UniProtKB/Swiss-Prot annotation:
The modification S-nitrosocysteine is found at residue 216. Keywords: ATP-binding, Cell adhesion, Cell cycle, Cell junction, Cell membrane, Cytoplasm, Cytoskeleton, Endosome, Immunity, Kinase, Lipoprotein, Membrane, Mitochondrion, Mitochondrion inner membrane, Myristate, Nucleotide-binding, Nucleus, Phosphoprotein, Proto-oncogene, S-nitrosylation, SH2 domain, SH3 domain, Transferase, Tyrosine-protein kinase. ATP binds at residues 19-26, 40. Changing residue 216 to A: Significant reduction in S-nitrosylation. Dephosphorylated at Tyr-245 by PTPRJ. Phosphorylated on Tyr-245 by c-Src kinase (CSK). The phosphorylated form is termed pp60c-src. S-nitrosylation is important for activation of its kinase activity. It comes from the Eukaryota. This is Proto-oncogene tyrosine-protein kinase Src. Non-receptor protein tyrosine kinase which is activated following engagement of many different classes of cellular receptors including immune response receptors, integrins and other adhesion receptors, receptor protein tyrosine kinases, G protein-coupled receptors as well as cytokine receptors. Participates in signaling pathways that control a diverse spectrum of biological activities including gene transcription, immune response, cell adhesion, cell cycle progression, apoptosis, migration, and transformation. One of its GO terms (biological process) is negative regulation of extrinsic apoptotic signaling pathway. The gene is SRC. The lineage of its organism: Eukaryota, Metazoa, Chordata, Craniata, Vertebrata. The modification Phosphotyrosine is found at residues 154, 245. GO terms for cellular component: cell junction; cell-cell junction; cytoskeleton; cytosol; endosome membrane; focal adhesion; membrane; mitochondrial inner membrane. GO terms for molecular function: ATP binding; connexin binding; heme binding; non-membrane spanning protein tyrosine kinase activity; protein phosphatase binding; protein tyrosine kinase activity; signaling receptor binding.
Amino acid sequence: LAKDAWEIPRESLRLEVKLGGCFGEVWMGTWNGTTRVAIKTLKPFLQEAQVMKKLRHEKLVQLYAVVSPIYIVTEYMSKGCLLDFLKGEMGKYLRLPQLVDMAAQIASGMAYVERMNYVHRDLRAANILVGENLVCKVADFGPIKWTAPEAALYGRFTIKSDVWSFGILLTELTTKGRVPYPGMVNREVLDQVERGYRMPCPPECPESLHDLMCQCWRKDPEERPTFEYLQAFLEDYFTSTEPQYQPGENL
Ligand SMILES: */C=C\C(=O)Nc1ccc2ncnc(Nc3ccccc3)c2c1
């Protein structure tokens, strides 16, 4: 087999609560008595896994250990997935300031991914974890509504198709987690997007933010901005772009 230094014995990990699981499971845990961990199990050819292993940033959930059945052990994110957090109870309270911040953190995790010349491929709220203090981190590196046309169609996945998903995740954030392209089914979305349709400005969301969404959704992957542009524009949002923002009923 020839394991690397990420490998531990199955006996080192103590599984406790179940937390969520179609293709496997997700548990809270304790690692050799001292350390709280999450544990992602798989249903019974890796690396692939060389991606979780080589990436290390503050806004990406940190791998701790892997096993061989196959287990993936990681830092524990206490608030679960962003999709659930947003449509749960602490969703009627989120306003644009908190939401753009959560958006700024994911852009930064993804800016790292970009400097490293990697691609995520399934960026969306279901794959962002939330911890204490509204910290967000990108997870689950390894459906078409989040996917850029050129990649749903021609397998052409790139950092720039990730940008596109980012823009879809922006509609998730600003709708408190609604499925995008509401009332449309996968085929209508593919057919309508190919023809130039784009989700309109979400209720109460500023135009300049919807405009960021539209940049993210350009037909030519190249004219989509970087995650580094995204990260910077989002962090500075309330001084440089909406200095006169005021809270409304929902945002
Ligand atoms: C959006 C669904 C989902 O994934 N929910 C979820 C709830 C609570 C969790 N706690 C801890 N970890 C995870 N997920 C996870 C995914 C990959 C690696 C580590 C943890 C979740 C997920």
